[PDB]
Design a binder for this molecule. Structure first.
Ligand SMILES: [K+]
Ligand SMILES: [K+]
Ligand SMILES: [K+]
Lengths: 214, 221, 207, 217
């Protein structure tokens, strides 16, 4: 029952470093190379290197040589990937991946869940929630100037979910994320029913509710 | 029985194109990449590219990306390489060689054709054959050298033989030299007993096939 | 190095159709290749290894073929769960990917426009949102105009994923204006162009 | 491209002795699949190349024990244990881990033999050639070893330069000697201006520089 469990998400400043772990289970750790692959948001797959967990030998992708380090601890069957001199570009999900067979196999049948690493000069902040006024009509909330990802949106504590779109966050030149949640509702209940956004940002503990009206 | 076969030679003009071929056996055509390798006269081997016959997948050396185009004809199990906009620098021997397939190859270029000579000629000029005779004071009762000066010809090659092939031992036909002329010149020499000079005929047979020129020069003291 | 060229970049098909993806390994003499499927929020999943071998638990409608360094992944009778991104792979190299998308009937966007909140103006900045809702295909060009002044560089778009039920998209384009730049302006508009619109549609409000 | 630097370009070896050829890749040529694709090829004179060693140290079909390959990463060595005359040719290293494949410079194996001084012969220009307009004076150095030789033309005791062109045979496969020609080209006008024509040869095997001469007419 092969399993690869990675550490949790991270947030780092430029020039810093991050160390991701990958704990393996269900097979002889030393009998399979461990590879690392990342994926910048909305981008393709990018190989970073492998490590031979039985010897500690490594191969690093040309792109990252000089600021990437891969190690292991056979006792606890854990592989590590440290990425240093961090840049904004390095914002991505980092995966550990294991070949299907021994030695120099590149068929990645086993993957970790991934470890998101955000690299940014920004500091934690709470979102600025604003209403999207009705001119079928559309209601909505604007979650502005927040960091880091993620933020959740709910409408009326889950009472209203049909026709609800929470848009993928967008990173502004400020370095802060901003998204908008909208919902299409019949003009019938514009005056009858109330609408509010249960916006919540766990990192900065900002739970906020804004109600919308004409 | 051979696994790859190539024609002998091609005479071609600058700016033109030439299409070299490489006949393969079914055994090789089924499973091997077909590679082409350049060898300029006297220089080393240079890999051009290769092609997988089953798919016409191609790989190239960037230097030959525009010079060389690789194809195959499935019915004849023949690999082709077209060389475009020919120049003097494309004068060379081009080899065919197979490479095993798989998750990359494993052994290497284990079977080579015999190569096709390509000569790019702007002019066709036959040679002048002058005698290199042993002079007045050649030590009598010793060994003497005589030869033939094959001067001012273009393109290579010229074949030189002595007495229609009967005289081989000690023959030294030197590598051709390109002159400021832009023409080729060489000498073929042989050593013989001095006492044979008044008696035995010595003829150099110089053949320059580019101009279909056969010349027999008698070398007298 | 090896150069993997995956095609097509995007593929729009209906369920039950046959999808054909291609990958070309240039500058390589390897005749084997792997394919992966990736859905949003999850790691890639191995589909095919060694060009034609299926991985464990992969349905028989997934087939892989290779000839030389030319490879194809074929999906017969596309199931709804098969619409995702697909990657080829040789050694360390991954193809650019192929977004396999559900094709549905052209649907025009119901356009909505919102002026900046007044609380946002108490904060000191203004952002005007323009929404295109439930439309198909994904391609759409949105334009802003301040008092009939085609603006550029100060807009930001966001597009949802394809809806799992109706297979449409929604788009969020937000204009960020300085409160100093905004209140000193009259009429701002949002002009939408879409394949299911006869002519472009405009939505506006005076400040 | 991966560059393959091969050392030496010329390798004098005596029959029965060991020859060792070195090749270095500008990059690591260990492939993604774990194999190292370095091969050693031999091209005998007038023949097509043939594969000797494959994957650093493995002999190809029909390759005798005395050929051995060693190395790791970027540093590779070919060794011929007891060189034989039939081993004469040009040896090439080759990397196939990266496309484009690349060959080394080539190492010419030269057979080391005892010193052999040349016999020098001089030839005056054709009487037939002289009517054409040019005058070619050929000086021959025959069956010598080693190949290093100094040829100097002296026209009426005056040295020459920019006037000559040399040509040297490939090492003989049987006696391992070289032969060399030096041609002094000149106009008929210049040729008839002077009287004495001599080539002075310097060589290890010669006690002192040998000179051979003729007087015009
Ligand atoms: K043929
Ligand atoms: K044949
Ligand atoms: K044919």
């Amino acid at each position: 029952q092969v399993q690869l469990v990675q550490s949790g998400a991270e947030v780092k400043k430029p020039g810093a470093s991050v160390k991701v772990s990958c704990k393996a289970s269900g097979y002889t750790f030393t009998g399979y190379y461990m590879h690392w692959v990342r994926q910048a948001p909305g981008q393709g797959l990018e190989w970073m290197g492998w490590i031979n967990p039985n010897s500690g030998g490594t191969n690093y992708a040309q792109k990252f040589q000089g600021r990437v380090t891969m190690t292991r601890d056979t006792s606890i069957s854990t592989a590590y990937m440290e990425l240093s001199r961090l840049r904004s570009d390095d914002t991505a999900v980092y995966y550990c991946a294991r070949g299907k067979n021994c030695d120099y196999n590149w068929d990645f049948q086993h993957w970790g869940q991934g470890t998101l690493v955000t690299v940014s000069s920004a500091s934690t902040k709470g979102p600025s929630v604003f209403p999207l006024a009705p001119s079928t009509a559309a209601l909505g909330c604007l979650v502005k100037d927040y960091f880091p990802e993620p933020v959740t949106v709910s409408w009326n504590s889950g009472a209203l979910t049909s026709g609800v779109h929470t848009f993928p966050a967008v990173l502004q030149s400020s370095g802060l994320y901003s998204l908008s949640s909208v919902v299409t509702v019949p003009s019938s209940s514009l005056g009858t029913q109330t609408y509010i956004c249960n916006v919540n940002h766990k990192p900065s503990n900002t739970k906020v509710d804004k109600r919308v009206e004409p | 029985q051979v696994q790859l076969q190539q024609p002998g030679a091609e005479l071609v003009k600058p700016g033109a194109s030439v299409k070299l071929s490489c006949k393969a056996s079914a055994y090789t055509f089924t499973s091997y990449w077909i590679n082409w390798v350049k060898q300029r006269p006297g220089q080393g081997l240079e890999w051009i590219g290769n092609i997988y016959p089953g798919s016409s997948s191609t790989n190239y050396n960037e230097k030959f990306k525009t010079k060389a185009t690789l194809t195959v004809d499935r019915s004849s199990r023949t690999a082709y390489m077209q060389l475009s906009s020919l120049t003097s620098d494309d004068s060379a021997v081009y080899y065919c060689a197979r490479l095993d397939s798989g998750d990359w190859y494993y052994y290497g270029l284990d079977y080579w054709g015999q190569g096709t000579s390509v000569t790019v000629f702007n002019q066709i000029k036959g040679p002048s054959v002058f005698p290199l005779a042993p002079s007045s004071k050649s030590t009598s009762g010793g060994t003497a050298a005589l030869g033939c000066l094959v001067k001012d010809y273009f393109p290579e090659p010229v074949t030189v033989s002595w007495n229609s092939g009967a005289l081989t031992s000690g023959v030294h036909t030197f590598p051709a030299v390109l002159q400021s002329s832009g023409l080729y010149s060489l000498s073929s020499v042989v050593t013989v007993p001095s006492s044979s000079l008044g008696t035995q005929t010595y003829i150099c047979n110089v053949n320059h096939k580019p101009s279909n020129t056969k010349v027999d020069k008698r070398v007298e003291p | 190095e090896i150069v993997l060229t995956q095609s097509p970049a995007t593929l729009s098909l209906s369920p039950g159709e046959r999808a054909t993806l291609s990958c070309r390994a240039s500058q390589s003499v390897s005749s084997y290749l792997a394919w992966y499927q990736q859905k949003p929020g999850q790691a890639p999943r191995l589909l095919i290894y060694d060009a034609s071998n299926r991985a464990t638990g992969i349905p028989a409608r997934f087939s892989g073929s290779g000839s030389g360094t030319d490879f194809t992944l074929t999906i017969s009778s596309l199931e709804p769960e098969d619409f995702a991104v697909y990657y080829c792979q040789q050694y360390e190299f991954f193809g650019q990917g192929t977004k396999l998308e559900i094709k549905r009937t052209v649907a025009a966007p119901s356009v909505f426009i919102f002026p900046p909140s007044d609380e946002q103006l108490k904060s000191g900045t203004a952002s005007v949102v323009c929404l295109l809702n439930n439309f198909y295909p994904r391609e759409a060009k949105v334009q802003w105009k301040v008092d009939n002044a085609l603006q550029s560089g100060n807009s930001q778009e966001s597009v949802t994923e394809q809806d799992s039920k109706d297979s449409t998209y929604s788009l969020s384009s937000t204009l960020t204006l300085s409160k100093a730049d905004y209140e000193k302006h009259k009429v701002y508009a949002c002009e939408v162009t879409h394949q299911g619109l006869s002519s472009p549609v405009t939505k506006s409000f005076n400040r």
